[PDB]
Amino acid sequence: GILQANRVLLSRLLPGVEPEGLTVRHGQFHQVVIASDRVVCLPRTAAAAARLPRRAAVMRVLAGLDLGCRTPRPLCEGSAEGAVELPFLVLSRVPGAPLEADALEDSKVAEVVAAQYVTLLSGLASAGADEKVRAALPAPQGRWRQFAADVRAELFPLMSDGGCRQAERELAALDSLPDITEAVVHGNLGAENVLWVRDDGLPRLSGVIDWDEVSIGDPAEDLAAIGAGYGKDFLDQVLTLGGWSDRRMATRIATIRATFALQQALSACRDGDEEELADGLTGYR
Amino acid sequence: MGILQANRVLLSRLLPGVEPEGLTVRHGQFHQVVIASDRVVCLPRTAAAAARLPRRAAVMRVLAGLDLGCRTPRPLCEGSLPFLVLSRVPGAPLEADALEDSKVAEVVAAQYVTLLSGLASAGADEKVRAALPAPQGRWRQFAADVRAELFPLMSDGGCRQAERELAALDSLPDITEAVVHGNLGAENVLWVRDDGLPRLSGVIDWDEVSIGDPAEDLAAIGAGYGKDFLDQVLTLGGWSDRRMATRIATIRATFALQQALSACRDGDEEELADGLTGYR
Ligand SMILES: Nc1ncnc2c1ncn2[C@@H]1O[C@H](COP(=O)(O)OP(=O)(O)OP(=O)(O)O)[C@@H](O)[C@H]1O
């Protein structure tokens, strides 16, 4: 296993910590070892290792943004960004737990949760128009067109005929999407990546984790994730509070939201997370 | 009234549904700090601190983008009492006792080295240098203050000793290499314990932050944990040269005077007494 394989390095990074007591999250390029107060990114390949210098820069940039909440802060020295490759990257662990959809049935919880989503997304949006932000973050062109290709190549073989027909309709709409490169976009802003304080009172946003797919892009991508997780009414509340309820935006969200389970399945496929692949392919096989 | 009751409107906005009377308040010189579970609310103690709070928020944002190998209080929200909401750095101070174990001591020293290296590296960044204060001849200004305020409280002998110590200060080169925390005592350095060996969580209380001489931070470490542990840090970090040693000793020798001076201004009689122990 990954803990066993990297036991020597982990003993140095986490002195006195028993390897078996730790946990692992699967990424496309990195395996993420989760300790009590910090996480250790271990590159799966040498190409993944060559990515880590850039990742350290990106996480430092995110750590400087005004989002109203925490992000995983790089615990390397600044010079690690100038390396050709790193054998690891350590980040601070964001405290808190996901919010279950249940909590939103209370309309005061819903308001306060929505407002904090708006602070986060407004900060990401404004940060998108900043050249030092734009310089450190990727900004792929025709990502939608290309995502559709990846789905047809990588996921259709795992689907039923009916599934492929369902997915085809969803993917086809994507070619209508404008290529928006305005905001910092998390790219995977499902409920498990948004952490709230385990404290008395109403939910308070602790921070956001798993920035693997972060880019300069379309804010509708993150709003789509929220809609997929929490449904139309909560989304509409976020859009209203944030000033984003125009029909152009609403339409892009709709289009992207219909692909969001496929985005999850594509991720699970590439990082070998079996259960999340099964979840993602629910109703496509 | 009470500070929690007094600030109840703001607290209800910043911490919705959180019972104010369940909170705690602490303070330093400039700020009343309401402590919540994962964050603190900094409120100005004076009209001066109120006017400077925007500036402080700017500095904290810069510090939040530095690679120090640990956490700092991240600005979450600022408004106008002006207020600043910062992330709460988890963990507790390390007691000197723990350093008696040499494996704990090596690991703790190494983590101080990372922190101090990060501060030093950041000091050569002009965007950092521009955002942070950098006073000229701070040690001469201090010396003038000590003579004006403390000498009258001191014996003749005491004044001889202090005058020597202050002379030594003037001899120092006026270094502006590093980000200097400026108040890096044990209580401002927080640790995760009981999960293997101590891990440095983060560092708090950055009100005295500046571009200056890192000997100042190293002096503070020696004050809190003694010369053996400081020696371990200096050796691990490659700072064990004579030049650094002299600067550290010179700064170290002014800690009692620094305490007496601050105690003399805020009328804290017991810290003024402690500070002046040698000098009267
Ligand atoms: N980010 C934080 N995380 C945890 N505790 C904090 C934080 N900020 C402040 N505190 C707590 O509040 C106390 C007072 O804060 P601090 O020393 O920063 O006050 P201050 O008046 O702003 O400082 P100074 O006297 O240096 O101007 C600290 O000793 C600590 O217990």
What does the domain layout of chain A look like in residue ranges? 2-92, 101-280
Chain B's closest residue to A21, CA to CA, is B195
Among the listed residues B200, B143, B132, the one whose alpha carbon sits nearest the alpha carbon of residue B172: B143
Contacts of B55 (CB under 8 A, 6+ apart): none
Instruction: Round to whole Å and give the CA distance between B89 and A219.
Output: 31
Q: Determine whether the shortest distance from the Cβ of B207 to ligand 1 is under 6 A.
A: yes
From the CA of B87, give the closest atom in ligand 1: 1
Tell me the CB-side half-sphere exposure of residue B262, using CA atoms within 13 A: 13
| Resolution value (Å, 1 decimal) | 2.2
* Other residues' Cβ atoms within 10 Å of the Cβ of residue A93: 19
Look at residue A217 and give its three-state secondary structure.
strand
Look-up of token digits 């203050």:
B145
Among the listed residues A39, A19, A41, A22, the one whose alpha carbon sits nearest the alpha carbon of residue A31: A41
Please give the sequence-ordered ranges of beta strands (E in DSSP) within B10-74, or none if there are none: 24-27, 31-35, 39-44
* Other residues' Cβ atoms within 10 Å of the Cβ of residue B134: 14
Instruction: Round to whole Å and give the CA distance between B185 and B191.
Output: 13
Which residues are registered as beta bridge partners of A208? Answer: A194
Cross-chain Cβ contact B121/A78 below 8 Å: yes
Q: Is A88 annotated as a binding residue?
A: no
Instruction: Round to whole Å and give the CA distance between A210 and A189.
Output: 9
Please give the sequence-ordered ranges of beta strands (E in DSSP) within A98-230, or none if there are none: 183-185, 194-196, 205-208, 215-217
Domain B3-87 sits in CATH 3.40.50.620: no
Look-up of token digits 């709230």:
A196
Among the listed residues B254, B257, B188, B272, the one whose alpha carbon sits nearest the alpha carbon of residue B216: B254
Burial annotation B68-87 (CB, 10 A radius, 16+ → b, else e) = bbbbbbbbbbbeeebbbbbb
Contacts of A129 (CB under 8 A, 6+ apart): A182
Return the residue whose CA atom lies nearest to atom 21 of ligand 1: B28
DSSP state of B205: -
Report the separation in Å between the CA atom of B63 and the middle of ligand 1, taken as the mean of its atom positions.
15
| Cα A7 from chain centre | 28
CA A16 to chain B, closest CA, distance in angstroms equals 4
Interface check B15 vs A, CB under 8 A: yes
H helices within B99-226, ranges in order?
A: 102-122, 126-131, 138-149, 156-171, 215-225
Instruction: Round to whole Å and give the CA distance between B179 and B101.
Output: 30
Instruction: Round to whole Å and give the CA distance between A276 and A158.
Output: 14
Chain B's closest residue to A68, CA to CA, is B76
Instruction: Tell me whether residue A285 is exposed, middle or buried, using C-beta atoms within 10 angstroms of its C-beta: 0 to 12, 13 to 18, 19 or more.
Output: middle
User: By 3-state DSSP, what share of chain B in percent is helix, strand and coil, each rounded to 5?
Assistant: 55, 15, 30
Count of H-run helices and E-run strands, chain B: 12, 9
Which residues are registered as beta bridge partners of A185? Answer: A215
Which CATH topology does B96-279 take? Aminoglycoside 3'-phosphotransferase; Chain: A, domain 2 (3.90.1200)
Contact B271, B262 (CB under 8 A): yes
Phi, psi of A49 (to 5 degrees): -65, -35
Q: What is the dihedral of CA A221, A198, B186, B134, to 10 degrees?
A: 30
Instruction: Round to whole Å and give the CA distance between A278 and B4.
Output: 50
| Cα B93 from chain centre | 13
Phi, psi of B202 (to 5 degrees): 180, -175
Instruction: Tell me whether residue A139 is exposed, middle or buried, using C-beta atoms within 10 angstroms of its C-beta: 0 to 12, 13 to 18, 19 or more.
Output: middle
Contacts of A137 (CB under 8 A, 6+ apart): A58, A61, A184, A214, A215, A216
Correct CATH for A2-92 of 3.50.50.60, 2.160.10.10, 3.60.15.10, 3.30.200.20? 3.30.200.20
User: By 3-state DSSP, what share of chain A in percent is helix, strand and coil, each rounded to 5?
Assistant: 55, 10, 35
Count of positions (residues) in chain A: 285
Select the residue of B69, B74, B76 nearest A77 (Cβ to Cβ). B69
Q: Is A73 annotated as a binding residue?
A: no
Instruction: Round to whole Å and give the CA distance between A272 and B210.
Output: 48
**B118 contacts on A by Cβ (under 8 Å):** 77-78
Instruction: Round to whole Å and give the CA distance between B8 and B18.
Output: 10
**Interchain CB contacts (distance < 8 Å): A and B:** 85
Please give the sequence-ordered ranges of beta strands (E in DSSP) within A171-226, or none if there are none: 183-185, 194-196, 205-208, 215-217
Q: Which amino acid is at A223?
A: L
Phi, psi of A95 (to 5 degrees): -75, 160
Instruction: Round to whole Å and give the CA distance between A233 and A110.
Output: 10
Tell me the CB-side half-sphere exposure of residue B239, using CA atoms within 13 A: 26
Q: What kind of experiment solved this structure? A: X-ray
Q: Determine whether the shortest distance from the Cβ of B201 to ligand 1 is under 6 A.
A: no
Interface check A38 vs B, CB under 8 A: yes
End-to-end Cα separation, chain A, in angstroms: 30
Q: How far is CA B168 from CA A21, B172, B178, in A?
A: 53, 7, 21
Instruction: Round to whole Å and give the CA distance between B159 and B250.
Output: 17
Interface check A141 vs B, CB under 8 A: no
Q: Which amino acid is at A165?
A: R
Which residues are registered as beta bridge partners of A38? Answer: A92
Instruction: Round to whole Å and give the CA distance between A217 and A125.
Output: 9
Please give the sequence-ordered ranges of beta strands (E in DSSP) within A158-239, or none if there are none: 183-185, 194-196, 205-208, 215-217
Burial annotation B209-244 (CB, 10 A radius, 16+ → b, else e) = bbbbbbbbbbbbbbbbbeeebbebbbeebebeeeeb
CA A125 to chain B, closest CA, distance in angstroms equals 17
Cross-chain Cβ contact A78/B67 below 8 Å: yes
Instruction: Round to whole Å and give the CA distance between A82 and B113.
Output: 20
Instruction: Round to whole Å and give the CA distance between B48 and B31.
Output: 11
Cross-chain Cβ contact B122/A76 below 8 Å: no
Instruction: Round to whole Å and give the CA distance between B202 and B189.
Output: 6
- Among B30, B31, B71, name the best residue to mutate to test ligand 1's pocket (greatest count of ligand atoms within 8 A of Cβ): B31
Contact A49, A1 (CB under 8 A): no
Among the listed residues A101, A97, A65, the one whose alpha carbon sits nearest the alpha carbon of residue A226: A101
Q: Is B31 annotated as a binding residue?
A: yes
Look-up of token digits 């989304």:
A235
Correct CATH for A101-280 of 3.30.70.2740, 3.90.1200.10, 3.65.10.10, 3.40.1190.10? 3.90.1200.10
Contact B67, B118 (CB under 8 A): yes
Contact A187, A264 (CB under 8 A): no
Q: How far is CA B38 from CA B23, B113, B249, in A?
A: 12, 27, 38
Among the listed residues B89, B88, B25, B86, the one whose alpha carbon sits nearest the alpha carbon of residue B56: B86
Select the residue of B38, B66, B122 nearest A197 (Cβ to Cβ). B38
Instruction: Round to whole Å and give the CA distance between A183 and A129.
Output: 7
Instruction: Tell me whether residue A77 is exposed, middle or buried, using C-beta atoms within 10 angstroms of its C-beta: 0 to 12, 13 to 18, 19 or more.
Output: middle
Select the residue of B70, B107, B118 nearest A15 (Cβ to Cβ). B107
Instruction: Round to whole Å and give the CA distance between A277 and A266.
Output: 8
Instruction: Round to whole Å and give the CA distance between A212 and A43.
Output: 13
- Among B33, B61, B184, name the best residue to mutate to test ligand 1's pocket (greatest count of ligand atoms within 8 A of Cβ): B33
Instruction: Round to whole Å and give the CA distance between A252 and A69.
Output: 26
Q: Determine whether the shortest distance from the Cβ of B204 to ligand 1 is under 6 A.
A: yes
Residue B148 tokens, joined: 């004006």
| Cα B49 from chain centre | 17
Which residues are registered as beta bridge partners of A196? Answer: A97, A205
Q: Which amino acid is at B238?
A: G
